[PDB]
Amino acid sequence: STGYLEELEKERSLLLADLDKEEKEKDWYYAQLQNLTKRIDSLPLTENFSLQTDMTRRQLEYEARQIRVAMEEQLGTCQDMEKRAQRRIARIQQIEKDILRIRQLLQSQ
Prior knowledge:
The protein has 3 helices and no strands. It is mostly helical.
């Protein structure tokens, strides 16, 4: 509400927003990548289109790799992402405990 308690409430709100934003960012990357995979998986495997199919497949593989690069540049590895989420969740839980105890110290007086 006021002072330190207000800072903690806002910290928690930011961390919840951080969790939500990162999930939406991951979803956006994964959608792009999944659509490229579907396109690859949809290529005709008839022998007569082999040259163009092969060339298209290699193009789409390239494009997928670039998106993976950009994703890693933004968010790190799958490991980095799971660690970050865990740290955020942990801080939120600590904050909630702090807020409860700090209110009680006030009320007591």
